[PDB]
A = this chain, B = another copy of it.
């Protein structure tokens, strides 16, 4: 697995048998993870960070300023852990990992849900001897896991910080990610998911990423970055290669089948399914203190759906980041997110 190979050092827990909620049984399942800091004697200073769609467990690489003394992820006070999701190319079981029935899983990797990841991740935490979680913190896909973690109850998960995220798959997002998968499906190199690993559907992947990358932006943000010279890169000419450069580097270092498997997780997401008759009723079952962090200008996860979260989670504070950035604000305004998270964790 060349994708996992490109990462820094990380741990792998192996679960010999895991039952997916579909009822499919995975065997001898790797779960990659990365932690920083040390558990206290009480084993109750654990902080779980849930990563984004395409990242690895190495949160430091896209959230570097959230780490350190007096920062949100304070390695002096907390044991901070991030576990890689099933379906990802970066160490946990997915299309890229070995199929214990021979050859990697490839196109045949079973469907997994947010709830599957949470269950398997809590198994790993149990093995590490974590007895209580001080907080779970997660953005985008991470915020969906974060919301799901909360259901363990306040006795195991003391606080949550869902960021830029939702309670359930929406038609809007389903459409954007389905569009992205279709770019891959239509790439003749895809061969139904049977492509050889060093001959990826690279155009499909690129295109999927250009689209995704733009949905992560706001109109003001791209307007500041690219604009025309006065009446009478940064110019509009430069848009072309900006779009190409980034999507190319990503297609060179991610797997098509994992992109499909990961985005499909979004379709399973619903915090209410099997639990409550509606989303507000399910949110009301979240008893922990919650800090909901959002931006007005997020084009994927709407301000209003966060306002809804804050309104139905009984002990919740809504934190609106003062920014014009759009969905990737939690990365572009990392310092503001850090302060908000740190302040919340300090009460």
Contact = CB atoms under 8 A, between A and B. Distances in A.
Interface of A: 168-172, 174-176, 178-179, 182-183, 186, 203, 206-207, 210-211, 214, 217-219, 222-228, 230-232, 236, 239-240, 242-244, 267, 270, 272-279, 281-282, 299, 302
A193 B224 CA distance: 32
Contact of A170 (B176, B206, B210, B222): B222
B172 A231 contact: no
Contacts of A225: 171
B219 A172 contact: yes
A226 to B, nearest CB: 3
Contacts of A243: 175, 178-179, 182
Please give the count of copies of this chain that the complex contains.
2
A272 B179 contact: no
A257 B62 CA distance: 40
Contacts of A244: 182
B274 A232 contact: yes
A338 B91 CA distance: 57
A244 B217 CA distance: 25
A232 B175 CA distance: 24
Contacts of A183: 207
Contacts of A207: 179, 182-183, 186, 207
B179 A211 contact: yes
Contacts of A182: 207, 210, 240, 243-244
B203 A186 contact: yes
A174 B230 CA distance: 16
